[PDB]
Design an enzyme around this catalytic site. Structure first.
Site, PDB file in Angstrom:
ATOM      1  N   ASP A  63     -10.408  12.678   1.717  1.00 33.38           N
ATOM      2  CA  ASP A  63     -10.600  11.637   0.719  1.00 33.38           C
ATOM      3  C   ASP A  63     -10.099  10.316   1.319  1.00 33.38           C
ATOM      4  O   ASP A  63      -9.394  10.313   2.340  1.00 33.38           O
ATOM      5  CB  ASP A  63      -9.798  11.974  -0.532  1.00 33.38           C
ATOM      6  N   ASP A  81      -5.731  14.329  -2.542  1.00 31.11           N
ATOM      7  CA  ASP A  81      -4.506  14.321  -3.334  1.00 31.11           C
ATOM      8  C   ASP A  81      -4.710  14.738  -4.789  1.00 31.11           C
ATOM      9  O   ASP A  81      -3.732  14.933  -5.525  1.00 31.11           O
ATOM     10  CB  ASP A  81      -3.822  12.947  -3.289  1.00 31.11           C
TER      11      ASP A  81
HETATM   12 NA    NA Z   1      -7.752  10.462  -3.904  1.00 29.83          NA
END
Ligand code: NA
Length: 218
Positions: free
Chosen positions: A20, A184
């Site tokens: 990401d 995350d």
């Molecule tokens: Na993220």
């Protein structure tokens, strides 16, 4: 320990790594984003903005259902004033801290041994910065750090929609079990796991280099 690439050794069944952007490569600060949007007139930004999955016109922008200009117009209508593209961009950049160059250097080192991809919820405002020499003081665009970028706004879906993962898998030809997905966000990790990816969920803002090295050798 010393996390420079030349000290590092890699051996496992993992062949591909999918990162990401926000929360992993660059720190997200939602409170700073809220402040930046309040500055434009979005007085209720604290209730609107999310760390992982936007809603409303913010979601529409990140899914490509609104163009940057259309989003600018509709955000302005919420704020009660006409916004320029530049101030709208600056509000979006409020989400981010300057990049930790240790992470960028680590990722460049990965490319010698792995196929590296980005899979991210993002938008043209953020990418006009990241995909340019202005990304960091090293002067390399985000593109230089990956084999390919899979961007929500170009694909019509935002994580954790299974559809965005499916597009990426089909386009890249990765085998999910040979791929480490680094994100995350919990919901994103859970769908990644369901689809067969190995997963690593670092803390936003934390230096994940050591732990990533451990995982890639497990
Ligand atoms: Na993220």
């Amino acid at each position: 320990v010393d996390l420079g690439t030349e000290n590092l050794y890699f051996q496992s069944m993992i062949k591909n790594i999918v990162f990401d952007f926000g929360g992993v490569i660059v720190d997200i600060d939602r409170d700073k984003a809220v402040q930046a949007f309040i500055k434009l007139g979005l007085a209720d930004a604290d209730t609107r903005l999310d760390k992982y999955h936007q809603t409303g016109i913010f979601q529409e922008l990140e899914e490509g259902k609104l163009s940057a200009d259309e989003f600018r117009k509709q955000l302005g209508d919420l704020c009660g004033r006409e916004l320029t593209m530049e101030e709208t961009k600056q509000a979006w950049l409020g989400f981010f801290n300057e990049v930790d160059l240790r992470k960028l250097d680590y990722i460049l080192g990965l490319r010698k041994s792995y196929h590296v991809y980005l899979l991210s919820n993002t938008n043209p405002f953020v990418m006009s910065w990241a995909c340019s020499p202005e990304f960091s003081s090293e002067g390399k665009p985000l593109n230089d750090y990956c084999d390919k970028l899979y961007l929500s706004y170009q694909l019509g879906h935002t994580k954790p929609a299974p559809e965005i993962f499916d597009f990426m898998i089909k386009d890249s030809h990765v085998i999910p079990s040979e791929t480490l997905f680094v994100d995350d966000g919990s919901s994103n990790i859970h769908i990644g796991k369901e689809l067969g990816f190995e997963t690593f969920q670092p803390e936003n803002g934390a230096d994940w280099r050591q732990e990533l090295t451990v995982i890639l050798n497990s």
